[PDB]
Design a protein around this ligand. Structure first.
Ligand code: GDD
Ligand code: GDD
Lengths: 406, 360
């Protein structure tokens, strides 16, 4: 028997590099059509013997989150619960504080998943290696660039026995190329070392990477399982769009009924495009690669959508072009209006480039990135929005370029 | 009488448009700007107009000999082999118009305005002196030469060629009538008449001033070209309301050539001139823009205040603004955005130009 613990964040800890959504929680942000933690929940429900799924995080229980829990529980036939910390206790502090709720039932092992990662989730492969060796900590690891590795947590391992010999967390200097991917497997013995860390804090909040992993590294307690598949972190808006592209390319192997087919009678589709069933798209519209449409969206006659994400209830009128942009829910784009952004992306010459995320200001200059439209933003007719972040409930009247519109 | 149009050497102004053809050959409201001035000169009744060009162009010779027959007057073309400024044209034309002692016309080519030629010769006859200047009151005197205006008599107190003195807001209008006596005064060596002949002629007081009624605009430079077209369509609506196209999906003052086709469901905005043979597909909104001939604008595209060159193909979902100028045979790929980009001819465009630079 296994359960799985998903570490959804809190509202302050998100501190978005570009705010993908001002009004909905980050873990409920729809990446490639479904919410961000629904990918974790589905990949955990595929694993045999999964009894329960817990979400630990200090969001207050607004009705969107509880409504998502209502939907997911009856969708996957698993009990999905939300355990709220009383205060921000850090990455591993919330695991130790709720040890009675996780340990109840005596699971054989339990997964810990970061909410913000977008990955393959090879949980069965990690489970086979864990059933082979039964070691307390198992870490997913990926290969990264020498420059990009300073943003993640670097792992130096023994290559033969696959055991961590050294761990360091966002180092100033280059240490190793393998990076922690935020997916772990915890044996029930592994809540015993966490407790030890708690006593040293009395002489509350336990950071799992800095206090547990970076201290016990090399002592035979932490083992890394290397992996191959797709991995990205959903930190910013551009990385959310790139993660949505990764999931839409992954959908061909698992859910071919999710991607829109070519459909010569209906709207044109090139590349991988998710369209919701409730959304009504006009047949003259053509939707370019890596485009997600939400529920209740009325994409008009002649719209071009490329590399975008349209949240639920947005309406785009005739002849509009939307490139590299996140359209908030309920937002209206007038006719002949163009919403454009700049795809920072990842380097095409680098062998293992991991698409870094930057927090809105390079060196005191606003940098071009994905255009964000807030909820219920009315873009008027025949107007251009370029590289902009528009706050919610705002109706524009003129064209804006490289600006945060308050 | 006779009339001298100063064509002259090719200018740096309007350069991406006039790399293929000369500057007086570009279609301005389906007509070259040679044609508008020689039209109103044919209405004036001058039997001989003369163009002073500083480099020979065979396609220009082709076009002038073609229009030569239907216009009904003889056209002589005198060639400056090395540029003598603008005063030197009269010095080379001195042996070409010295046979008659009758005041002649001189026009700049790049001006477009209402042409008051019979009132011009009446003003020149009544004032009786050698040089008569046409002037106009405008917005900004900082681009042109400023004059001083009188009472009923109209004798110019002083001429200034260059701005920043701000003595009046009146400017030179670019068309004058000159006598045969002042053509003695100008030598054959290179100088410029507007700067150096008028400045000593204004001291005695022979120069007089007459002010234009409507819609003077220089069109040598492309944003001046666009505002001159937009100002031309107003007075063209008042003078000829039958030439301007009216439609159910058309707003404002639109002139469309009858060879041109326009798809349905598309909104042609105010002050738009479509050249002969353009193919505008459906769902294309064009405002304040002139599209030259043979240019195909594909569907779902937006264009405000630009100039589209000859035999050009604008892609789908293309947004252009800020007087972007396209040359002859320019290809714009789909879903691009051009803002302020003057494009050289025969060049495909594969990247967005959001910031106003000239492209190769
Ligand atoms: N319950 C709770 N959860 C939290 C808290 N703080 C963060 N989390 C969640 O824990 C996950 C990681 O938290 P971060 O502290 O922001 O880590 P990071 O800078 O994003 O980097 C971590 O993940 C990378 C891959 O995503 C790893 O490469 C890196 O080693 C590190 O573990 C995120 O989903 C965040 O929402 C908290 O105080 N309480
Ligand atoms: N024959 C000949 N004609 C020339 C030459 N250079 C220019 N011209 C003609 O002279 C006219 C004026 O050319 P510009 O160089 O653009 O003059 P400007 O800076 O605009 O100033 C002149 O025109 C203004 C109105 O447009 C006037 O306001 C100002 O006083 C001045 O006369 C143009 O139509 C050009 O064809 C030349 O070398 N030879």
């Amino acid at each position: 028997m296994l359960k799985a613990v998903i570490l959804i964040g809190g509202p302050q800890k998100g501190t978005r590099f570009r705010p993908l959504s001002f009004e909905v929680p980050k873990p409920l942000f729809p990446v490639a059509g479904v919410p961000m933690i629904q990918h974790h929940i589905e990949a955990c429900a595929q694993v045999p013997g999964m009894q329960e799924i817990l979400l630990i995080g200090f969001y207050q229980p607004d009705e969107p989150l509880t409504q998502f829990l209502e939907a997911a529980q009856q969708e996957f036939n698993l009990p999905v619960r939300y355990l709220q910390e009383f205060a921000p206790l850090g990455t591993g502090g919330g695991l130790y504080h709720f040890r009675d709720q996780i340990l109840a039932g005596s699971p054989e092992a339990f997964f810990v998943l970061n909410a913000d990662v977008c990955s393959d989730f090879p949980l069965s492969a990690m489970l086979e290696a864990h059933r082979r060796q039964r070691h307390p900590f198992l870490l997913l690891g990926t290969t990264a660039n020498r420059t990009q590795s300073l943003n993640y947590g670097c792992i130096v391992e023994n290559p033969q026995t696959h055991e961590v010999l050294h761990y360091v967390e966002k180092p100033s200097t280059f240490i190793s190329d393998i990076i922690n991917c935020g997916i772990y497997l915890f044996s029930p013995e592994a809540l015993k070392p966490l407790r030890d860390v708690f006593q040293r804090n009395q002489q509350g909040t336990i950071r799992l990477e800095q206090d547990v992993f970076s201290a016990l590294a090399g002592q035979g307690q932490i083992y890394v399982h290397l992996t191959d598949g797709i991995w990205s972190q959903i930190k910013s808006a551009g990385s959310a769009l790139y993660a949505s592209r990764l999931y839409l390319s992954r959908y061909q192997d698992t859910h071919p009924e999710r991607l829109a087919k070519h459909t010569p009678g209906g709207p044109w589709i090139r590349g991988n495009v998710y369209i919701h069933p409730t959304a009504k798209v006009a047949p003259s519209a053509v939707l370019g690669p890596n485009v997600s449409i939400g529920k209740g969206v009325t994409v008009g006659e002649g719209v071009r959508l490329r590399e975008s994400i349209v949240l639920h209830g947005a309406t785009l009128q005739e002849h509009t072009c939307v490139l590299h942009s996140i359209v908030g829910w309920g937002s209206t784009v007038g006719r002949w209006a163009r919403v454009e952004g700049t795809p920072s992306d990842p380097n095409p010459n680098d062998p293992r480039a991991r698409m870094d995320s930057e927090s809105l200001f390079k060196d005191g200059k606003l940098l071009p990135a994905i255009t964000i439209l807030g909820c219920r933003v009315r873009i008027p007719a025949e107007v251009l929005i370029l590289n902009s972040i528009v706050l919610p409930h705002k109706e524009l009247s003129r064209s804006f370029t490289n600006q945060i519109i308050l | 009488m006779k009339a001298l149009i100063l064509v002259g050497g090719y200018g740096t102004r309007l350069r991406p448009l006039t790399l293929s053809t000369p500057k007086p050959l570009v279609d301005f409201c389906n007509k070259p700007i040679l044609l508008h001035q020689v039209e109103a000169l044919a209405a004036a009744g001058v039997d001989h107009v003369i163009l002073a060009v500083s480099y020979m162009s065979q396609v220009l010779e082709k076009e002038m000999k073609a229009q030569e027959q239907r216009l009904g007057i003889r056209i002589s073309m005198s060639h400056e082999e090395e540029p003598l400024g603008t005063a030197g044209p009269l010095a080379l034309a001195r042996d070409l118009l010295s046979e008659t002692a009758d005041p002649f016309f001189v026009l700049n080519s790049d001006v477009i305005c209402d042409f008051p030629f019979q009132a011009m010769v009446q003003f020149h006859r009544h004032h009786g002196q050698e040089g008569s200047i046409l002037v106009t009151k405008v917005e900004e005197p900082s681009k042109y030469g400023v004059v001083v205006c009188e009472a009923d008599t109209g004798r110019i107190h002083r001429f200034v060629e260059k701005p920043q003195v701000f003595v009046s807001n009146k400017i030179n209008a670019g068309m004058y009538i000159l006598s045969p006596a002042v053509l003695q005064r100008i030598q054959l060596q290179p100088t410029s008449i507007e700067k150096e002949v008028f400045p000593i002629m204004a001291k005695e007081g022979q120069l007089y001033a007459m002010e234009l009624q409507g819609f003077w605009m220089d069109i040598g430079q492309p944003k001046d070209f666009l505002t001159g077209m937009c100002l031309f369509l107003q007075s063209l609506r008042q003078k000829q309301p039958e030439r301007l196209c009216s439609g159910p999906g058309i707003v404002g003052n639109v002139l469309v050539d009858p060879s041109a086709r326009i798809g349905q469901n598309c909104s042609i905005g105010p002050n738009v001139s479509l050249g002969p043979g353009v193919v505008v597909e459906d769902g294309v909104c064009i405002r304040r823009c002139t599209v030259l001939r043979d240019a195909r604008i594909r569907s779902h595209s937006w264009l405000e205040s630009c100039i589209v060159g000859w035999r050009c193909r604008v892609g789908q979902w293309v947004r252009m603004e800020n007087v972007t100028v396209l040359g002859e045979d320019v290809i714009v790929n789909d879903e691009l955005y051009l803002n302020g980009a003057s494009v050289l001819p025969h060049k495909s465009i594969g990247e967005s130009v959001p910031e106003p630079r000239i492209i190769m």
